[PDB]
Structure 1
Amino acid sequence: EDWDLVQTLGEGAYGEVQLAVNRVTEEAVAVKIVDMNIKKEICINKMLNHENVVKFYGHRREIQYLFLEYCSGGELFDRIEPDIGMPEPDAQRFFHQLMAGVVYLHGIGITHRDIKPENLLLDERDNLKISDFGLATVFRYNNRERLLNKMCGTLPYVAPELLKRREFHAEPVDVWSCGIVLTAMLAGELPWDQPSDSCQEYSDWKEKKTYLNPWKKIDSAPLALLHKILVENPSARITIPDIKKDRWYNKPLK
């Protein structure tokens, strides 16, 4: 082909992700290599078009190769200093972009199911892009909502209902994991291993022990939002349109 695999960008799972550069136009893109879920990832990618979602260029199979937008900014994960987090103004901006990305996905009945800082990429202007749809699934089709039942995700970003219920709504699960992401951004640590009662840290949160880490590192305005997102009852949990009206979310930041 006309593309040279310059270097490995990401690794693990089905295949490593590599940076390809066109030796003619010289445009750079990302190439995901998978050797035989992948069918659904491609299908889903075809539906997506948003400036806060990693662009899908197209695909070819020599082992399937997917051409994705290249984010030179790397992953959000690497903008979080451990135990510190990041300046609140950057966190808010990143959160606003994450919300737009998610509103969009949910708007077309798609749930990501694995929202975490490793999957939130940054472009050259530090714009955030939702990445990897290999675990994404349809939760609304023909205006009909389907509850989920398969357990997906990453334990620290996972919502509690997903551990204790046979079926659950998709949207609040993505909302929960965005809250865990906000926590990571403002405190540089994850609150718990998983959201179960067997887990001391989660039990402490439910009891409102905000004088513990990581909550003590978080200003009271964002923390009030986190109080509304990390609500155990997925029916009580704040929804995105209501997040959009939250005081911290609308607070101008230096």
Structure 2
Amino acid sequence: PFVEDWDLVQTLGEGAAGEVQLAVNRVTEEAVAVKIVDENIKKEICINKMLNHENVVKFYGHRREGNIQYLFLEYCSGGELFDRIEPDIGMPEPDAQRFFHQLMAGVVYLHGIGITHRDIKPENLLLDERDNLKISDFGLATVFRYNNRERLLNKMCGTLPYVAPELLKRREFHAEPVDVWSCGIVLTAMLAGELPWDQPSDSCQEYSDWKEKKTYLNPWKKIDSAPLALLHKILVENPSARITIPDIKKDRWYNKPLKK
């Protein structure tokens, strides 16, 4: 008895849909995160039911109590990756490499089952009790591969400082290079504690400086040559020339043994 009863003990986050609360089981004391949402929710639930990976936030189930949708998801006691990034500093390079390895494992998993996240950012990257990175929030996610047939995307979504330039310049684009680009912006943020530009467009001076290879400027001047050589391959404007994840796994810094 009472094993199905949950107590809402604290607010974890706030969003456009509603709120995220820490729920504790009355009998077992198990902790879960409950997403309270007042077509978009139906797709999020269907995508979440497909997921089963150690670097993806677990989905336990859903319950509709009237007009309110309750999504039962993994509680990650380490919090957001965002709070591990010290403004204008970043974090120790070995910590950033380990989180980047875990982020790649998660993204490889999603792309392998034909899912694109479309909003990778440190706010959506959570940490469990052992600081294992978990990809979260599949509210903007979509199926880009079905019956081994790829479909090109055209919808404008994500967060401007993390979006790939093809999203702003092209009518249609491949899904996988978009997620790779956002992972490169996350890596920049982890190693420099700042985002390189407001958006990836010619009108943006910081973006033009990068295309002109002015790496003597911030945030690039704070980043060591080995991770910076990887960022030069990820943050490539043409998505067809941008490095793919199998080639990121062969990168020199990606395979560099690091210890604080």
TM-score by length of 2: 0.97
Query: What is the Cα-based RMSD across aligned positions, in Å?
Result: 0.8
- Report how far residue 134 of structure 1 moved: 0.1
- Report how far residue 12 of structure 1 moved: 1.8
- Does 1:83 find its partner at 2:88? yes
Q: Residue 133 of structure 2 aligns with which residue? A: 128
- Report how far residue 13 of structure 1 moved: 1.2
Q: Deviations over 1:72-112 (max 9, x none)?
A: 11000000000000000000000000000000000000000
Q: Percent identity?
A: 99
CA distance in 2, matches of 1:26, 1:187: 39
CA distance in 2, matches of 1:151, 1:37: 15
- Does 1:174 find its partner at 2:168? no
CA distance in 1, matches of 2:163, 2:218: 19
**Aligned structure 1 segments of 4 or more residues deviating by more than 6 angstroms:** none
Q: Residue 170 of structure 2 aligns with which residue? A: 165
- Consecutive unaligned residues of structure 1, counting only runs of 5 or more, are none
- Report how far residue 229 of structure 1 moved: 0.1
Question: The residue matched to 1:221 in structure 2 has which SS?
Answer: helix
CA distance in 2, matches of 1:219, 1:39: 44
> 1:197 aligned to 198, 202, 226, which one?
202
CA distance in 1, matches of 2:38, 2:144: 27
CA distance in 2, matches of 1:69, 1:34: 16
- Report how far residue 36 of structure 1 moved: 9.7
- Report how far residue 24 of structure 1 moved: 0.3
Question: The residue matched to 2:177 in structure 1 has which SS?
Answer: helix
- Does 1:228 find its partner at 2:216? no
- Report how far residue 152 of structure 1 moved: 0.6
CA distance in 1, matches of 2:13, 2:27: 24
Q: Deviations over 1:165-203 (max 9, x none)?
A: 000000000000000000000000000000000000000
CA distance in 1, matches of 2:119, 2:39: 22
Greater displacement, 114-123 / 7-16: 7-16
